[PDB]
Every structure is written in structure tokens, then in C-alpha cells.
Subunit: 219 residues, 3 copies
């Protein structure tokens, strides 16, 4: 059921926050503190999202089906910080950071329009949103990776792992979307929630740990 | 269905035992043999639990719902050995081992009372059981980790990984419990079984492999 | 539902192909190119299988139930290449390769007979197919591992990980089979599809990445 996964999401994000929080406090140096604090806020942001959705907020019937528009409101806040874990670890220049944040903001807004518009029109917006996402794939796969590998020549494998896991996790969101009642409707509303919840826990708590392990590798 | 996951649990634990068994035999030295044998017994204990539950044993209708009280009977036997993988790898002193086993035994007995008592009374016992679990979180996170890191100074990352994975896996059990009909009832009896089965395979077969990889790291 | 997982399978294998394809192109040397190309074809083969099954092809009612015989047609093509990732990485001699491919081909054909025959007769074929699989377990666990470890003495852990993950993943297929309506019928046709799809994505996309990480370890 929808409620079950929304409550699993609340506790998992809340417990993720406690761990990153206890890590933020008791951090060795400033570099460790910033990384734990970024991840603490990401999980606090997702905890709030799931708490509102679990309590039945941020949902309205759009085009016949119940739609959690609040997901886009918070993804607009957490995804930029999730991209900052990468640029912070990589020590990426401000212009590339701006490009990434720019493309990320374009993808979510057009992605939001695809969710609230009736079909076939929504497919146009889904396509626009995917092109913005493919602009991010390129930025991380090419200029981000190159700059990060030239800055950390003994740790090329750490950035390949960061980027690849990021690519695998972020690609499943438009897939879930196109297979849900928003697209082809191959599965219900209940499966869509389970999928987004598993994806969110993985992209926030999971990537959270991966970014800390990456910093231990970099030393 | 309940039966499906109970039979997946039997085979997974049985197959886990065969692998640790074949490892116990053909072990290089005594240190490797003890680790494979600990894990062999853990999985043999879980195989028996799932075989009894799959055959419909160790279940009675308590407070209107069917309750697998046999889970606590075997968790009382396997969880102490799962804590011994940690103290064995870490080379932890007997007093700390006793403290861990003590808190672990207190958590399961009060945890068992929470399962057999009617609500609201059961919430008191759930809270007592959680405090005992938080005493274990502390012991592993602080004196266990410190002693293990001072004994293995080149392998601090191995113990951070052992402890963190242990913390993530063991925390999901009270979550599953509070969301099941024992607590808030956000999901059925069929989902509770699937969850405990996935958790058990992960905590026994999965942690089993993680503890062997940790020993290879320590050399 | 059956269709949902079949479409998740199509996209996941298609996306796996794009990644290995983009890797095949842009590969440093010949060794990297062969590995990415092997994995590119494996995923292209699975993409085709799922596309046919998703479009309702390669299925007929055998012994009362709908049976996807096309799974065995493609497993006959992809599993030999999945074994070649191992022999290619390990630098295994042609005779052992032939033995592995031989036992693999025997397992699938008898495995195919078990699927199309009525029960109890099908159990005989399931048993024959399992013995052929246990001949593969032995070959990878013993002569393959020994030869690969003597060729790569600083990378014994890489081959233990390749072999173990292969052993864990390939063992779940006969388990899924014996628990489905083909055997004991502990779960429906819809769960069987979900299970094979999760197993296939893991054994092809997942093992795909694991074999690339193994090559980075070997250098
Ligand atoms: C913590 C939340 C995360 C990491 C979610 C990120 C969401 C996306 C990458 C979604 C992208 C979408 C498309 C590429 C096209 C339209 C549909 C979207 C919005 C799901
Ligand atoms: C192999 C089995 C394992 C690792 C299970 C461990 C079980 C727990 C850590 C359960 C703890 C519980 C609470 C902290 C409060 C009450 C409910 C329990 C018993 C599920
Ligand atoms: C990419 C597809 C993969 C890796 C599938 C491999 C399938 C097997 C190892 C199945 C083996 C079977 C038995 C050992 C006995 C009869 C049933 C089978 C065919 C499922
Ligand atoms: C809902 C949960 C929100 C989590 C809030 C705070 C996490 C705790 C931060 C840790 C500070 C404790 C100080 C310490 O002991 O190091
Ligand atoms: C109606 C029953 C609602 C249950 C009440 C409270 C659950 C809230 C606990 C979750 C922790 C807060 C997470 C956060 O926003 O940081
Ligand atoms: C109903 C109000 C919905 C409007 C808020 C959604 C904005 C989300 C976004 O900008 O991505
Ligand atoms: C919450 C949403 C905030 C989003 C982005 C934070 C903006 C900070 C990014 C600027 C780069 C950091 C820097 O100044 O070096
Ligand atoms: C949104 C505004 C940010 C635009 C600035 C982007 C700088 C691009 C240069 C680069 O990609 O390195
Ligand atoms: C630097 C990038 C900042 C992101 C800004 C992106 C703006 C995208 C432009 C147009 C999207 C369409 C505006 C939304 C109208 C939706 C109407 C509706 O709610 O039905
Ligand atoms: C019964 C309805 C029929 C269902 C047909 C579903 C067809 C699925 C095919 C293609 C999915 C669209 C491709 C996904 C976009 C790739 C994500 C990205 O842009 O990175
Ligand atoms: C230190 C490196 C370790 C990182 C390796 C782990 C990589 C695993 C990545 C992705 C697989 C996880 C996918 C599970 C998320 C749920 C997806 C869904 O339900 O749609
Ligand atoms: C080393 C520290 C990492 C260890 C454990 C944390 C693993 C992250 C858990 C999130 C998994 C997401 C999911 O549910 O699939
Ligand atoms: C139910 C399954 C129970 C498993 C029982 C025993 C595992 C086999 C132990 C391995 C001993 C074989 C000797 C060897 O070849 O090394
Ligand atoms: C009624 C049908 C019951 C099926 C019969 C036997 C299944 C037992 C096989 C499981 C291996 C034993 C596990 C163990 O206890 O070590
Ligand atoms: C019915 C008999 C149940 C009594 C056995 C349960 C004991 C479990 C425990 O001590 O943790
Ligand atoms: C089965 C339940 C047995 C539980 C615990 C085993 C007791 C052994 C613990 C003592 C520490 C080991 C030692 O003597 O060094
Ligand atoms: C149960 C009995 C065990 C009590 C002994 C605990 C010793 C505590 C000292 C320590 O934590 O290091
Ligand atoms: C060293 C720690 C050993 C663990 C001993 C813990 C004992 C806990 C004390 C009291 C728990 C309550 C006793 C169980 C009564 C349950 C009655 C019932 O079954 O309904
Ligand atoms: C060892 C003491 C644990 C036993 C707790 C009593 C509850 C089990 C029972 O009902 O018999
Ligand atoms: C429809 C019924 C409403 C459901 C409300 C569910 C509320 C869930 C909120 C909190 C869960 C309890 C917190 C879990 C305990 C933390 C585990 C631990 O002690 O380590
Ligand atoms: C060598 C280090 C490798 C260890 C890293 C792996 C860490 C992954 C840990 C936890 C995620 C797995 C959670 C899946 C268990 C099922 C949970 C459930 O269904 O409730
Ligand atoms: C290196 C050896 C470890 C490799 C494979 C074993 C992985 C453990 C499998 C248990 C997974 C638990 C689960 O079902 O989530
Ligand atoms: C269905 C998807 C099939 C995938 C087909 C081809 C994958 C793309 C191969 C990459 C070649 C592009 C050249 C390059 O930019 O390196
Ligand atoms: C009826 C609707 C069918 C949907 C149509 C086309 C989906 C095909 C897209 C999948 C990519 C091809 C995979 C491959 O074979 O390489
Ligand atoms: C109906 C035709 C089925 C025959 C094709 C299946 C062959 C599979 C195999 O050889 O393993
Ligand atoms: C598609 C099915 C093809 C199956 C196997 C490919 C045959 C090549 C195996 C021979 C070993 C490679 C070599 O010649 O060195
Ligand atoms: C099928 C034919 C392949 C038979 C050849 C097998 C060679 C066996 C020698 C070996 O295992 O090293
Ligand atoms: C080198 C190994 C090559 C693999 C060849 C294996 C051949 C196995 C032998 C006999 C299997 C039975 C033949 C299939 C008859 C099925 C009849 C039917 O479809 O109902
Ligand atoms: C209601 C019907 C009863 C269901 C009983 C199911 C019994 C399950 C017992 C054993 C499963 C068969 C063993 C699996 C084969 C091992 C795989 C291998 O050969 O490697
Ligand atoms: C670089 C080494 C990393 C490899 C370690 C990961 C090992 C995990 C292996 C197996 C667990 C995954 C099982 C999930 C597949 C789905 C199974 C099913 O649904 O039947
Ligand atoms: C280092 C590169 C590997 C990182 C991510 C790829 C993980 C493989 C994803 C397949 C997971 C299979 C599954 O769904 O369980
Ligand atoms: Cl969020
Ligand atoms: Cl470096
Ligand atoms: Cl147990
Ligand atoms: Cl050390
Ligand atoms: Cl295939
Ligand atoms: Cl080597």
C-alpha cells in the first residue's frame, strides 16, 4: 500500500538524518563536517517530504489521478545539494557547478509541467525534461569527471564509481515516470510510490554513504 | 504470500550453510575456520527457524493475529553469534562481549514481551526493547570501534564498514515491527514475513560474506 | 503485473547496452574493448528477449500454464558469453572454457525439457539440469579459480569476488524455478516474472559492471 511505503520513507530519511547529524557533530576537520552536513540536510529535506505525503498533504487529483506535486517541490531543494556532493568532492569550478545546477533546475520544472499536463501534451514536456537530464549525464560523464580525475590522479576509480552510481540511480526516475499512469500506465499508483520511495532512499541515504566512503578514499 | 517467502528463507539459509560449511572445511588456518564455522551455525540456526515456520510450527493466534513466536526463540540463539563475528574480528575483551551479549539478550526478551502483550501495554515493552538496542548502538559505535581501530590501525575502514552495515541492518527490525499489525499496522502479515525474510537473509547470509571479506582485509 | 516487469526488463537491458556500447567505443586498449563489447552484446541479447516477451511473443500454454519458452532460447545465447567474461578475465585455457560451455549448454537444454514436460517427469529433468549446474559450480570454484589466482597472484580477491557473486546469482534461478508453478507452486506466474527479471538485470547489467571493476583491479 501507498501509506506503508510513505511511512518507510519517513523513518528511513529521519534515521538517515540522525546518522549524518551525529557525523556532522564529531567530525575531524571542516571538509568532513561540510560533507556530513550536506547529507544531513538532504535527508532532513526528504524526511519532511515523506512526512507531508504520509499525512496526505501535497496531493491533488490532476487529470483523474491523485498526483503528489510536493515531490517536485522538494526534489527542487534536495537534488541541487546531491549535485553539490559531487562538485564538493570533485573540487569542480563554479561555472560547471552553475551549468549542472542550471540543467538540473530546467529538468525538474519541465518535469513538473509533464506531471500536471494532460496527455499527449505531457509527452512533449517529458521529452524536454529528458534532454535536460541528458545534458547532466554529459556534464558528469565528461567535464566533471576529467577535472576531478586531473585533480585526484591516484583516485580515478572513486570518481568513476561516484558518477556511475549517480547515473544508474538518476536514470530510473524517468523510467518509473514513463511506466506509471503519467505515461504508459504499465503499473498502478501504489507501485509508483514504492518505486519512488526505494529510489529516494537509495539516492539520498545510499548515495550519502557512498559520498562519505569516497572522501575516505581521497583521504 | 507468507509461504513463498518462508520457503525462499529455508533454501537461502540452507544454501548459506553449505557455502560456509565448505569454507569451514578447506580453511587455511584456525582463525579462518572459526569465522566460517560461526557463520555456518548462524545459517543452520536460521534454516531451522524457517523450516519450522514454513511447516506451520511456532505460530499461535495472539491478540487476534497469527504470531510467529519461534522468531524470538531462534533470534535468541543466532543474534549472540552474529555479535561474536564482530568481537572475534575486532579481538574485543570479554567484558565488552558480555555487555553486548547482555544488552542483546535484554532487547530480545523485552522485544518478545512486546509481541505477546496486547496494546497499549506492548508499546511500553517496545520502548524498553528499543533502549536496550540503543545501548548496543553505543557499544559498537564507541568502545567496540575504538578498541578494534587501536588493535588494527591500518584497517580502520574495515571496522567502520562492519559497524555501519550492522547498524543499518539491525535498525530495520524495530521499524518493520512498529509498522506491522503489532504497532501501527501500515502493512499486512504477508508483508511483515517478506520484510523479516529479506532482513534475515541480509543479516545472516549477507553479513556472513561481509565478515569474511573483513578478515581478508585484516589478512 | 507481468507486463510491468517485462517493460522494466526491456528498458534496463536497453540502457545497459547504451552504457557498455559507449564504453566499447572510447575504450583505451583492445582488452577493455573486448570486455565492454562482450557485455554490450549480452545486454542487447537480453533487451531482445524482454522486448519479445513484453510484446507477447515466445509464450504458449504448456501443461495448463503460460510458459515463456523464449527465455531458454536467449539464455542459450547470453549465458555462454557471461561465462566468457570469466574465462576472458581469468585468461583460462580453451579446454576448461569448452568444459564450462559444455556443461552450461547441457544444463539449459535439460532445463528446457524440465519446463516443457508434465510432472512428475519434469522433476527428473530438473535433477539432471541441477547436476550439470553443480558441475559448473565445481569448475569455477576449483580449476578456474586456481588457474586465475596463479596467473594473477596479487589479485586473488578479485577472482573470489567474481566467482562468489556468479555462484550466488546463478543459484537463485533453479530456486525460482522449483518454487514457481513448474515445481512446488509456492508463488504465481506474476511473481516468477518479477523474480526472473530482477535476476536477469542483476546477472547481466550488474555482473557487467562487476567484470569491468575486476579489470580495473587487474590493471
Ligand atoms: C533525491 C531525488 C532525486 C535524486 C530525484 C531526481 C529526479 C529525476 C532525475 C527525475 C527526472 C525526470 C525526467 C528526466 C523526465 C520527466 C520526469 C522526471 C521529472 C521524473
Ligand atoms: C539474525 C536476526 C537478527 C539480526 C535480528 C535482530 C532483531 C532485532 C535487532 C530486533 C529488535 C526489536 C526492537 C529494538 C524493539 C521490539 C521489537 C524488536 C524485537 C524487533
Ligand atoms: C543471463 C541469464 C542467466 C545468467 C541465467 C542462467 C540460468 C540458470 C543458471 C538456470 C538453471 C536451471 C537449473 C539448474 C535446473 C532447471 C531449471 C533452470 C533451467 C532454471
Ligand atoms: C527526525 C530526526 C531529525 C534528526 C535531528 C538531529 C540529528 C542529531 C544530531 C547529532 C547531534 C548530537 C551531538 C552528538 O552527540 O554528537
Ligand atoms: C497520525 C499519526 C502521525 C504520526 C505522528 C508523527 C510521526 C512523525 C515522526 C517522524 C519524524 C519527523 C521527521 C522530520 O520531519 O524530520
Ligand atoms: C498546486 C500548487 C503546485 C505548485 C507548486 C509546484 C512547484 C514545483 C516546481 O517548481 O518544480
Ligand atoms: C536549497 C537549494 C539551494 C541550492 C543551491 C545552493 C547554492 C550554492 C551553490 C554555489 C556553489 C557553492 C560555492 O559558493 O562555492
Ligand atoms: C544558470 C546559469 C549558469 C550559467 C553559467 C554556466 C557556465 C558554463 C561554463 C562551463 O560549463 O564550464
Ligand atoms: C537556470 C534554470 C532555471 C530553471 C527555469 C526553467 C523555466 C522553464 C520554462 C518554462 C516551463 C513552463 C512554466 C510552467 C507553466 C505550467 C502551467 C501549469 O501549471 O499548468
Ligand atoms: C500497455 C502499454 C504499452 C507500454 C509500452 C511501454 C513502452 C516502453 C518504451 C520506452 C520507454 C521510454 C524510454 C525511457 C526514457 C529513457 C530515460 C532517459 O531519457 O534517460
Ligand atoms: C563503494 C561502492 C559501492 C557502490 C556499489 C553499489 C551499486 C548499486 C547501485 C544500484 C543498484 C540499486 C538499485 C536499487 C534501487 C531501487 C530501484 C527501484 O526500485 O526502482
Ligand atoms: C560503508 C558504509 C555503507 C554501509 C551501509 C549503508 C548502505 C546504504 C543503505 C541504503 C540502501 C538503499 C536501498 O534500500 O536500496
Ligand atoms: C541443509 C544444508 C545443511 C548443510 C550441511 C553441511 C554443509 C557441507 C559441509 C562441507 C563439508 C564437505 C567437505 C568438503 O568437501 O570440504
Ligand atoms: C510438505 C513438503 C515439505 C518439504 C520437505 C522438505 C524440505 C526440507 C529441505 C530443507 C533443508 C533443511 C534445512 C535445515 O534444517 O538444515
Ligand atoms: C508459546 C510458548 C512461547 C514461549 C517461548 C518464547 C521464548 C522466547 C524468548 O525467550 O525470547
Ligand atoms: C547459542 C547461544 C550461545 C551464546 C553465546 C556463546 C557464549 C560464548 C561467549 C563467550 C566469549 C567467547 C570466549 O570465551 O572467548
Ligand atoms: C550480563 C553480564 C555481563 C556484565 C559484565 C559487563 C562488563 C562491563 C565492562 C565493559 O563494558 O567494558
Ligand atoms: C543478561 C541479560 C539476560 C536477559 C534477561 C532479561 C529479563 C527481562 C526481564 C523481564 C521480562 C518480562 C518477563 C516475561 C513475562 C512475559 C509474560 C507473558 O508471556 O505474557
Ligand atoms: C532467559 C529468560 C527469558 C525468558 C522470558 C520469559 C518469556 C518466555 C515464556 O513465556 O516462557
Ligand atoms: C494509519 C496509522 C498511522 C501510522 C503512523 C506511523 C507513525 C510512524 C512513526 C514513528 C515510528 C516509530 C519510530 C521507530 C523507532 C526507531 C527504531 C529504534 O529505536 O532504533
Ligand atoms: C564490502 C562492503 C560491502 C557492503 C556494502 C553494502 C551495504 C548495503 C546495506 C544495506 C542495504 C540492504 C538492505 C536490503 C535488506 C532488505 C531490507 C528490507 O526489506 O526491509
Ligand atoms: C565477495 C563475496 C560476497 C558476494 C556475494 C554475496 C552477497 C550476499 C547476498 C545476500 C544478499 C541479501 C539480500 O537478499 O538482500
Ligand atoms: C536499444 C539501445 C541499443 C544500444 C545501441 C547502441 C549503443 C551506442 C553505442 C555507442 C556508440 C556512440 C559513439 C560514441 O560516442 O562513443
Ligand atoms: C505496443 C507498444 C510497444 C512499444 C514500442 C516500442 C518499444 C521498443 C523500445 C525498446 C528498445 C529496443 C531494445 C532492443 O531490442 O535493442
Ligand atoms: C515452441 C518451440 C520451442 C522450441 C525452441 C526452444 C529451444 C530452447 C533450447 O534449445 O534450449
Ligand atoms: C552466441 C553463442 C556463442 C557462444 C560461444 C562463442 C564461442 C567462442 C568460444 C571459444 C573461446 C574463445 C577463443 O577462441 O579463444
Ligand atoms: C563440449 C566439448 C568440450 C570438451 C573438452 C573439455 C576439455 C576438458 C579438459 C579440462 O577440463 O581442462
Ligand atoms: C556440449 C553440450 C551440448 C548440449 C547438448 C545436450 C543434449 C541433451 C540431450 C537430450 C535432451 C532431450 C532432447 C529434447 C527433447 C524434448 C522433447 C520435447 O520438446 O517435449
Ligand atoms: C505447498 C507446497 C510445498 C512446498 C515445498 C517446497 C519445498 C522446497 C524444498 C526444496 C527445494 C529444492 C532444492 C533447490 C535445489 C538447489 C539448487 C541447486 O541445485 O543448486
Ligand atoms: C565490487 C564487488 C561488489 C559486489 C558485491 C555485491 C554482491 C551482491 C550479490 C547478490 C545480492 C543481489 C540479489 C538481488 C537479485 C534479485 C534476486 C531475486 O529477486 O531473486
Ligand atoms: C562501479 C560501477 C558500478 C555501479 C553501479 C552499477 C550497479 C549495477 C546495477 C544493477 C543492479 C541489479 C538489481 O536491480 O538488483
Ligand atoms: Cl526531497
Ligand atoms: Cl588522489
Ligand atoms: Cl535465527
Ligand atoms: Cl591493521
Ligand atoms: Cl538472455
Ligand atoms: Cl595480479
Amino acid at each position: 500500500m501507498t501509506q506503508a511505503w510513505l511511512w518507510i520513507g519517513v523513518i528511513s530519511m529521519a534515521l538517515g538524518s540522525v546518522f549524518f547529524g551525529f557525523g556532522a557533530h564529531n567530525a575531524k576537520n571542516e571538509r568532513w563536517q561540510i560533507l556530513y552536513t550536506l547529507n544531513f540536510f538532504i535527508c532532513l529535506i526528504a524526511a519532511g517530504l515523506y512526512l507531508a505525503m504520509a499525512l496526505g498533504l501535497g496531493v491533488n487529483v490532476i487529470n483523474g489521478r491523485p498526483t503528489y506535486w510536493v515531490r517536485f517541490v522538494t526534489w527542487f531543494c534536495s537534488t541541487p545539494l546531491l549535485l553539490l556532493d559531487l562538485t564538493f568532492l570533485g573540487r569542480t569550478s563554479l561555472p560547471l557547478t552553475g551549468s549542472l545546477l542550471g540543467a538540473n533546475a530546467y529538468m525538474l520544472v519541465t518535469g513538473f509541467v509533464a506531471t500536471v499536463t494532460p496527455k499527449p501534451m505531457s509527452y512533449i514536456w517529458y521529452i524536454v525534461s529528458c534532454a535536460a537530464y541528458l545534458a547532466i549525464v554529459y556534464l558528469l560523464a565528461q567535464p566533471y569527471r576529467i577535472a576531478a580525475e586531473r585533480k585526484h590522479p591516484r583516485s580515478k576509480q572513486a570518481f568513476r564509481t561516484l558518477v556511475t552510481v549517480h547515473l544508474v540511480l538518476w536514470t530510473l526516475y524517468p523510467i518509473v515516470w514513463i511506466l506509471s499512469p503519467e505515461g504508459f500506465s504499465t503499473f498502478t499508483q501504489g507501485s509508483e510510490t514504492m518505486f519512488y520511495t526505494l529510489l529516494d532512499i537509495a539516492s539520498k541515504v545510499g548515495f550519502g554513504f557512498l559520498s562519505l566512503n569516497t572522501l575516505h578514499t581521497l583521504e
